[PDB]
Amino acid sequence: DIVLTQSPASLAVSPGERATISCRASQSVTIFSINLMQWFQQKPGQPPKLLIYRASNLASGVPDRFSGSGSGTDFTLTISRVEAEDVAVYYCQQTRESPPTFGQGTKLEIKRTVAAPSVFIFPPSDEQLKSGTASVVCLLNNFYPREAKVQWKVDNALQSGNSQESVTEQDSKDSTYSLSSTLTLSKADYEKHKVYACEVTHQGLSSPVTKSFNRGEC
Amino acid sequence: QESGPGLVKPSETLSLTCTVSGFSLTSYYVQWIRQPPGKGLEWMGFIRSGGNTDYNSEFKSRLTISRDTSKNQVSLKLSSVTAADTAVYYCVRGGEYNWDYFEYWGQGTLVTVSSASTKGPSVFPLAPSSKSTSGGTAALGCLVKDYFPEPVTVSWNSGALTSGVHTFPAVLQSSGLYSLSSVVTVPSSSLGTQTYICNVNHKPSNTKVDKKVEPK
Lengths: 218, 216
Fold this sequence. Notes:
The complex is a heterodimer of chains A (218) and B (216). Chain A is mainly β. Helix content of chain A is 5%, strand content 50%. Chain A contains 2 helices and 21 strands. In chain A, strands 2, 6, 7, 8, 11, 12 and 13 form a 7-stranded mixed β-sheet that branches. A 4-stranded antiparallel β-sheet of chain A has the order 1-3-10-9, with no helix packed on it. The longest helix of chain A is centred in the last third of the chain and has 6 residues, at 187-192. Chain B has 216 residues and is an all-beta fold. Chain B has 2 domains: 6-112, Immunoglobulins (Immunoglobulin-like, Sandwich); 122-212, Immunoglobulin-like (Sandwich). In chain B, strands 1, 3, 4, 5, 8, 9 and 10 form a 7-stranded mixed β-sheet that branches. In chain B, strands 11, 12, 13, 15, 16 and 17 form a 6-stranded antiparallel β-sheet that branches. In chain B, strands 2-7-6 form a 3-stranded antiparallel β-sheet, with no helix packed on it. At the A-B interface, strand 7, strand 8, strand 12, strand 14 and strand 15 of A face strand 8, strand 9, strand 11, strand 12 and strand 13 of B. It is classed as immune system.
């Protein structure tokens, strides 16, 4: 089977600037003077979309900023002027031999200015507490870069082992990330304590931001 | 069966069906390609003109691709399934139209190979308050908890509210059940005038839950 090896594995490009992604093949993908190399884009949460076929032919409805080059074993996808909507994993594919094979993908990130998170806290619903479980949620919204530290404090005691974080992929419009930290406690442990606090540390923040609530009031 | 995710018990046979429009078109063929979770893409096989088929030798033991001209449908059947067959399956329609080759990958169907039973979600509000406000902006949302298997899709106001929506990737919990939250930022002025409803779709359990989120 032909193996396709892409480079780079990941890259970060400022809007307006050029992205260059290469794809190497173990064997020639050329037959009848045709280079059977395709390029695909998989945006966050979406199926793959054909961008280019036969090395250099743009698919319908693909912007002209996407261009394919190369022959034989060496191929290149160039995005001339990157847009925020281009955040995706890009994949090479060979159809010269069966089975068709794909590269392992190249992750394109969009470089933007530092943006501090907007922080929000959500107490557990009374409906959920009746079931015996309390989920406390803290939201970090519209921030860059991805690195952030979220610490939970219950009655001023830092928590460990009882929190899970989830992060969105970069937004297609503003190139930011958002993050959820969910603290999960038994109903009893939740009712044993009063002050629930989310402390956030990020490059965009000169000092940590704390969002807090007292169990019982709003 | 396309864009209808669900469960297929280990050792059983996965049967997926796709509705195709273009048996009439030139160059027409359907490829079946899968993407395991967190992974890349794997080509399984194709069915062409006249029901001629080609298969990847990794699955030739257990893979049959068929077509039904009566119902404009193409099907995949994968026998003796294991957890390694857990993946998004794509029915890829391809051919020539206008002056260009095209591929339509569809929506994809997440198939989870599990002996565990389906469970619909418990939906709880992430209610707006003074602690969910920033400069005239309020955050609100829905916590979608204890569902199996993936996936859950979340809309707001039946698709009318799209700006400011962030649906987080699901987390597998200790319990073997999944949880996610979908949030939206809105004007704090709208909290008393606009209704906010999360529409949560769990096709594996045949369940759809609408939750109105009200201010505190």
